[PDB]
Design an enzyme around this catalytic site. Structure first.
Site, PDB file in Angstrom:
ATOM      1  N   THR A  29       0.826  -1.198   0.000  1.00  0.00           N
ATOM      2  CA  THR A  29       0.000   0.000   0.000  1.00  0.00           C
ATOM      3  C   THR A  29       0.863   1.251   0.000  1.00  0.00           C
ATOM      4  OG1 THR A  29      -0.053  -0.106   2.394  1.00  0.00           O
ATOM      5  CG2 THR A  29      -1.903  -1.068   1.195  1.00  0.00           C
ATOM      6  N   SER A  30       0.363   2.311  -0.627  1.00  0.00           N
ATOM      7  CA  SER A  30       1.093   3.567  -0.681  1.00  0.00           C
ATOM      8  C   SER A  30       1.332   4.088   0.734  1.00  0.00           C
ATOM      9  CB  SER A  30       0.316   4.598  -1.503  1.00  0.00           C
ATOM     10  OG  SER A  30       0.422   4.310  -2.887  1.00  0.00           O
ATOM     11  N   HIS A  88       8.893   1.089   3.010  1.00  0.00           N
ATOM     12  CA  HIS A  88       8.451  -0.151   3.647  1.00  0.00           C
ATOM     13  C   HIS A  88       9.737  -0.913   3.906  1.00  0.00           C
ATOM     14  CE1 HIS A  88       4.112   0.015   3.267  1.00  0.00           C
ATOM     15  NE2 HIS A  88       4.204   0.341   1.990  1.00  0.00           N
ATOM     16  N   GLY A  89       9.667  -1.914   4.773  1.00  0.00           N
ATOM     17  CA  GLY A  89      10.840  -2.700   5.091  1.00  0.00           C
ATOM     18  C   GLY A  89      10.569  -3.919   5.951  1.00  0.00           C
ATOM     19  N   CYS A 130       9.454  -0.566   8.512  1.00  0.00           N
ATOM     20  CA  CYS A 130       9.201  -1.713   9.375  1.00  0.00           C
ATOM     21  C   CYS A 130      10.436  -2.611   9.437  1.00  0.00           C
ATOM     22  CB  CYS A 130       8.003  -2.521   8.875  1.00  0.00           C
ATOM     23  SG  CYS A 130       6.397  -1.679   9.052  1.00  0.00           S
TER      24      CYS A 130
END
Ligand SMILES: COC(=O)C[C@H](NC(=O)OC(C)(C)C)C(C)=O
EC number: 3.4.22.56
Lengths: 141, 92
Positions: A29-30, A88-89, A130
């Site tokens: 997700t954006s 993100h991660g 993350c």
């Protein structure tokens, strides 16, 4: 010498990688609200006298070459270096818009022996992403 | 000689293995707090001390709210990973 020398002609670079939109295939997700961070960091680091460079929506490949080209720069006149990763991660992983990239591969470019003009100078990596799927349910005080 | 891994500071938004929260309107809890602390203390405190303040602000002032009970009422602690060999001050 208990404090790093920060009286060089320049404070240094502040590379901000701001990934907001990811390839459909990734299923991520954006990162709505991420522009507010990028703008905040930019203003904040401009006040600390850093040469800010914002890059938006970079692929896993573009993140590498960007980091590689920066480490290949002459930081002699710079006191330090800063890089912020907004994306993100997962544990030890940062996501490009098209896929994951190991944090190690990124930071290695700046290793004391691989980037001589930054040896002995503080290399800061601010990572907003993350690091797994666990949630902290907290505890009452 | 010095270690090639020396003089590196990794300021993570959250602890190893955990989620990192971001508010679609205000931005991430971590980046939000970091900028505020830097804007207020970078002209007096040392970096580790400022990052410790960021740690308290994120741990105390933020709690998730979600219609999904699975993500509701969650907290977060940032993670300072320092291999620095000297004190860092953003001034001289
Ligand atoms: C830095 O902000 C995010 O993109 C991190 C992202 N976490 C995340 O989006 O959490 C929510 C969906 C905002 C609650 C992740 C799992 O890597």
């Amino acid at each position: 010498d208990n404090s790093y020398k920060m009286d060089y002609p320049e404070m240094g670079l502040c590379i901000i990688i701001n990934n907001k939109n990811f390839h459909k295939s990734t299923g991520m997700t954006s990162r709505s609200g991420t522009d507010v961070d990028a703008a905040n960091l930019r203003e904040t680091f401009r006040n600390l006298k850093y040469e800010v460079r914002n890059k938006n929506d970079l692929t896993r490949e573009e993140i590498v070459e960007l980091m590689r080209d920066v480490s290949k720069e002459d930081h002699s006149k710079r006191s330090s270096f800063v890089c912020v990763l907004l994306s993100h991660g997962e544990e030890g992983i940062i996501f490009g818009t098209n896929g994951p990239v190991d944090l190690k591969k990124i930071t290695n470019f700046f290793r004391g022996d691989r980037c001589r003009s930054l040896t002995g100078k503080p290399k800061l990596f601010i990572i907003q992403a993350c690091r797994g799927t666990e949630l902290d349910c907290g505890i009452e005080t | 000689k010095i270690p090639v891994e020396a003089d590196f500071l990794y300021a993570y938004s959250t602890a190893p293995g955990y989620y990192s929260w971001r508010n679609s309107k205000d931005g991430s809890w971590f980046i939000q707090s970091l900028c505020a602390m830097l804007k207020q203390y970078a002209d007096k405190l040392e970096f580790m001390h400022i990052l410790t303040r960021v740690n308290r602000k994120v741990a105390t002032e933020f709690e998730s709210f979600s219609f999904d009970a699975t993500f509701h009422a969650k907290k977060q602690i940032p993670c300072i990973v320092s291999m620095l060999t000297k004190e860092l001050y953003f001034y001289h």
